[PDB]
Design a protein around this nucleic acid. Structure first.
Ligand SMILES: [Mg+2]
Ligand SMILES: [Mg+2]
Ligand SMILES: [Mg+2]
Ligand SMILES: [Mg+2]
Ligand SMILES: [Mg+2]
Ligand SMILES: [Mg+2]
Ligand SMILES: [Mg+2]
Ligand SMILES: [Mg+2]
Ligand SMILES: [Mg+2]
Ligand SMILES: [Mg+2]
Ligand SMILES: [Mg+2]
Ligand SMILES: [Mg+2]
Ligand SMILES: [Mg+2]
Ligand SMILES: [Mg+2]
Ligand SMILES: [Mg+2]
Ligand SMILES: [Mg+2]
Ligand SMILES: [Mg+2]
Ligand SMILES: [Mg+2]
Ligand SMILES: [Mg+2]
Ligand SMILES: [Mg+2]
Ligand SMILES: [Mg+2]
Ligand SMILES: [Mg+2]
Ligand SMILES: [Mg+2]
Ligand SMILES: [Mg+2]
Lengths: 118, 115, 194, 195
RNA sequence: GCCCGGGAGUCCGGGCACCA
RNA sequence: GAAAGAAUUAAAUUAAUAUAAUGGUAUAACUGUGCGAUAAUUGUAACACAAACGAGUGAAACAAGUACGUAAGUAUGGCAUAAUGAACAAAUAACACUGAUUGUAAAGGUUAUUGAUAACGAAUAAAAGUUACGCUAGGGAAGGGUAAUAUAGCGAAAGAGUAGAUAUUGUAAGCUAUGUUUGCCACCUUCGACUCAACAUUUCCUCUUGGUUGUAAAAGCUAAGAAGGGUU
RNA sequence: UAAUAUUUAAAAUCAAAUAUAUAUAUAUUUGUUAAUAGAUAAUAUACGGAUCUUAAUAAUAAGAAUUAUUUA
RNA sequence: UAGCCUUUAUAAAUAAUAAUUAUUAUAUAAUAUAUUAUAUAAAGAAUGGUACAGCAAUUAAUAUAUAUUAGGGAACUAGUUUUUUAAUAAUAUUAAAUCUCGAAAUAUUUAAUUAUAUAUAAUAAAGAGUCAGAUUAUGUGCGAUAAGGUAAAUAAUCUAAAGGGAAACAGCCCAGAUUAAGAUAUAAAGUUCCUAAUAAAUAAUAAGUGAAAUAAAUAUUAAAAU
């Protein structure tokens, strides 16, 4: 019909970009957590520097942040597998897999955890 | 009838007022077929099994120990207090009538009686 | 039977119906001093089938029952519909009487001393007739009913007579016990082998 | 006797649906619960029609017939009725007429298994290969000690799994309804319900 | 609904209004 | 230790529900019974749900009277969701509201009720065809896609083949390719003959070759290369 | 160590890494084949095209422009 | 007509939008086996029955040198055994648009708090246009798991959107042009030349496979693991 010339693989450059994006997302989360921790420290009664130093850093309480922190639910880039950085689970593909770059707004969308065996 | 093609519209039944929400006496809370929810404190039930508020207050959904395997919707009279209210503690009533200060009005009220 | 909790679906599940049957069964308690077999009640049901046509027959049957027993029967209506036999619901057909206490004892005595003996070829109750929780049943033909005292005294009065079933409920846990008990009251069980 | 023609009372048409790609890792129908050697699906889930199944069955049967005390059992039944429109007709004017029966087969499911003291495993394997040729997927031979297909490039052993008691779990972390029931059971409530 | 023809009742066929 | 009572627990459920299906229902709405035929009453109905409007749905409360109930209370028809139809014009009653000079009336209005527009928001009380003799305004409100069918090929091999699946054959089922057929979609609005042919190869002949208990030879059959020339 | 019959797996197992008490234990995370054929029509080859696969002897010097995992 | 848009304005106006707290459990500390504070874990107030998961009940399917119920055939002298036929029961296994006993995420959604106020909501007086949409992705119905097909659902873009990339390109990937300027960050995409910009590392490939549109069963050859 109408030619949408989009390849089934990604170029190395694309892959690298994807990786970078993933890393950035992780970093954002990390930063958020750090901020929360330092706020907690300040509330308790410490300085900024002191808070930064502290061995026992506080985990976040809010559900979403906690979930993000868990690597079971939301892996970090170094943890993540090759097969999940550049492919998603498609319920109706051959091999039940599909290049992430096919997913509508893949540059914004985050999607790490494919199914366990698929 | 080679083709079918008939059907009725959706009935829009369901919860119309959620836990924590402030109702006013009369407001419909839940629409339903049958009683999936039962009337609780300060709540009435109409011909459709529609649950509605009898008093101004806050809507709550609860499980009543006295009635296992039944879900309740009720109106707590004020927000702070829980609704499957302690069985022996005195029942929190509203009264909710104002007194006729205006003297003429009061007089009129005094005068008026049953037929 | 309760469900094995080896899966989360078993959680709020209704239990499995008994391995053997659909219905649940009672516990058999040992026969001690507190729960010896005894006669509980005697139910007589005379479902006159010819009453599908003639409704007066039902009335006559009821009267006969009353005469036999000395306590008011209750009408038996046709509970089902079926075309093969001419049967339609809402039709009085026969009478049913619940006998208890002294009256039931009296009835049993009458059955044993007079009727069952007088019936020509009677070889006794069948041993297979156990309800299985200590209940026993047997029939009487239309002819045997003539042998009752209240009917025998006036054969002129009773042209038509109607056969009946007799059910006997006992405090027995099992059928064999019940039949033994019945034998004590002079009931011949020479009908068969258990 | 009628796995290929299930006798439903009300012969009713059925929406096409979709073949499940059991993502929670089902393992159900994927093990050979009777029989020695089996035939499993290796590829993506597929809709196998009754005719195909029958043909496969017949192919297998010729291998079994010779065996003394040898038999074949069929693990799946064609339960979904398929309606097909006449080729000549155009779009519209409702759904077509009942054509045939099919079965949705997930990725790792066993179609058939066999057994028969006499049979050499090689022969069985051959038979299953032959059967495969009649079916619309790609198939694999399974033995009594071959690990279960979960995904399409992933396996597992059913013996290695969490043997839980779920009542206990519930008790540990209870639902609201259960709690309510418990409360009700507790003395005062029981006393004062006054039904 | 009202009026006929084949004391009341049933069962049938005619009309006469109503026809917005 | 027994008898009786009060029960309680379990199971409750597809039985029953005026009536389809769904949701509910034993604390019963389900069943039985007493009284009662009364809430299948009368004015105001806030406020919600729903909702374009017209409509619809639940309904607290105020007042008037009634039924049952020791009382608490409960009843504004039916366990719930279908069971329906606007205005206009007519018709019947009530109202005391106007009464075209005044008084009566007529007529209109208010309240209550009646019959249908099922194309069911109903164009009129009242309405079918044909035009290839047609005309006007407009709209498009074989190609492209698909490959079910078709043709072609493969994989596996039931079975033929005087024996032996695989010389030659090759059921039904499998996997594909082509866009040469019959269709489907609606992006988009003529079959033959003559003349001249160009291109392709899935080759009919001619050239080379492998297989052929079915290559003795000659004729064949089948397969590989091959489009140079030719193909009434 | 030869031959032998399957399988193409990190589920299990092993290795490595991260988080919890911590030289261990617990929990999570990641790591398991490749070619060739099958392969095909009509204006013209058709990765967009050029073209790209490296080699001593010698280059102040080329060494994938493919596929997979990465770095700056 | 409502929906979506605009103009002017109103206020004992923050009602709007977004998130958080709200629950359960464990550990520690303090008071009276409870309450508070701190930490940690848990898909964490209330509403729900899709996926997934399941075969319970309902509807369907399979297997028994198993049990029962009768029948057919059979041996010896009606009794009996075996071979079974069907049904029911038992045990095991299975699936479904109109089965869900377990059961997500997304979702609907509440009060207070915090953030958005050159901001949002509500209302009042005025105006419109629109009511043949298209594609992409996801989950579907119809079709044959055909269609650049058709019908709806969710999101985006196009419609009405220029710019960079996808060779060319409505709908893809990024990004919204007030006007310039061109120093610095860059997005998606790329970096031998055409053509703006590149150097490395480890493997694999010898087919030009492949190099921005992956063609299947199957066969052959090799390689690992047991
Ligand atoms: Mg394009
Ligand atoms: Mg509906
Ligand atoms: Mg399923
Ligand atoms: Mg029901
Ligand atoms: Mg009622
Ligand atoms: Mg309205
Ligand atoms: Mg009309
Ligand atoms: Mg009309
Ligand atoms: Mg007309
Ligand atoms: Mg056409
Ligand atoms: Mg075409
Ligand atoms: Mg050729
Ligand atoms: Mg070409
Ligand atoms: Mg290129
Ligand atoms: Mg408008
Ligand atoms: Mg559904
Ligand atoms: Mg229109
Ligand atoms: Mg379209
Ligand atoms: Mg336009
Ligand atoms: Mg643009
Ligand atoms: Mg826009
Ligand atoms: Mg702008
Ligand atoms: Mg190439
Ligand atoms: Mg290509």
């Amino acid at each position: 019909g109408l030619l949408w010339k989009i390849p089934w693989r990604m170029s190395t450059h694309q892959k690298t970009r994807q990786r970078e994006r993933l890393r950035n997302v992780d970093q954002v989360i990390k930063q958020l957590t750090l901020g929360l921790h330092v706020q907690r420290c300040q509330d308790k009664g410490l300085t900024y520097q002191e808070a930064m130093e502290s061995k026992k850093k506080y985990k976040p309480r809010s559900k979403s942040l906690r979930l993000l922190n868990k690597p079971s639910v939301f892996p970090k880039e170094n943890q993540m597998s090759s097969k999940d950085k550049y492919w998603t689970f498609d319920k109706k593909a051959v091999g039940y897999r599909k290049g992430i770059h096919k997913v509508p707004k893949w540059t914004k969308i985050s999607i790490r955890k494919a199914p366990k065996f698929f | 009838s080679r083709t079918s093609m008939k059907d009725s519209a959706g009935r829009r039944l369901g919860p119309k007022k959620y836990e924590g929400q402030d109702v006013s006496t009369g407001e419909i809370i839940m629409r339903q077929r049958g009683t999936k929810f039962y009337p609780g404190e300060n709540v009435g039930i109409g011909k459709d099994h529609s649950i509605f508020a009898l008093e101004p207050g806050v809507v709550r959904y609860y499980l009543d120990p006295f009635h296992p395997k039944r879900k309740f919707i009720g109106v707590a009279l004020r927000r702070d207090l829980k609704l499957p209210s302690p069985h022996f503690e005195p029942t929190v009533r509203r009264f909710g009538r104002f007194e006729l200060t205006n003297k003429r009005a009061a007089y009129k009220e005094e005068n008026s009686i049953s037929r | 039977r309760a469900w094995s909790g080896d899966s989360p679906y078993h959680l709020n599940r209704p239990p499995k119906n008994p391995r053997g049957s659909k219905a649940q069964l009672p516990d058999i308690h040992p026969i001690k001093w507190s729960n010896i077999p005894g006669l509980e009640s005697v139910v007589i049901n005379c479902f006159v089938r010819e009453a599908r046509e003639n409704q007066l027959l039902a009335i006559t049957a009821a009267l006969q029952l009353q005469q036999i027993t000395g306590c008011k029967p209750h009408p038996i209506f046709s509970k089902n519909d079926v075309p093969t036999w001419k049967l339609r619901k809402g039709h009085q057909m026969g009478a049913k009487v619940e006998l208890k206490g002294k009256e039931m004892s009296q009835f049993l005595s009458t059955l044993t001393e007079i009727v069952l003996p007088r019936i020509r070829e009677y070889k006794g109750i069948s041993n297979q007739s156990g309800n299985r929780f200590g209940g026993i049943s047997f029939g009487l033909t239309a002819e045997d009913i003539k042998f009752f005292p209240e009917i025998d005294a006036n054969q002129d009065s009773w042209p038509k007579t109607f056969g009946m079933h007799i059910n006997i409920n006992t405090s027995a846990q099992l059928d064999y016990q019940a039949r033994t008990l019945l034998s004590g009251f002079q009931f011949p069980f020479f009908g068969e082998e258990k | 006797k009628h796995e290929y023609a299930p006798r439903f009372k009300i012969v009713q048409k059925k929406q096409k649906g979709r073949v499940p790609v059991r993502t929670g890792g089902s393992i159900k129908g994927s093990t050979l619960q009777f029989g020695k050697y089996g035939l499993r699906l290796k590829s993506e889930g597929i809709r196998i029609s009754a005719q195909q199944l029958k043909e496969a069955d017949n192919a297998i049967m010729r291998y079994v017939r010779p065996l003394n005390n040898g038999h074949l059992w069929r693990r799946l039944c064609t339960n979904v009725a398929v309606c097909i429109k006449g080729n000549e007709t155009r779009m519209g004017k409702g759904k077509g007429g009942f054509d045939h029966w099919m079965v949705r087969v997930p990725t790792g499911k066993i179609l058939f298994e066999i057994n028969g003291d006499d049979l050499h495993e090689k022969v069985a394997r051959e038979a299953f290969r032959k059967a495969g040729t009649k079916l619309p997927g790609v198939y694999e031979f399974v033995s009594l000690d071959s690990l279960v297909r979960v995904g399409l490039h992933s396996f597992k052993n059913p013996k290695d799994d969490p043997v839980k008691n779920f009542y206990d779990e519930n008790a540990k972390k209870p639902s609201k309804k259960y709690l309510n029931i418990l409360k009700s059971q507790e003395p005062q409530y029981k006393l004062f319900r006054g039904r």
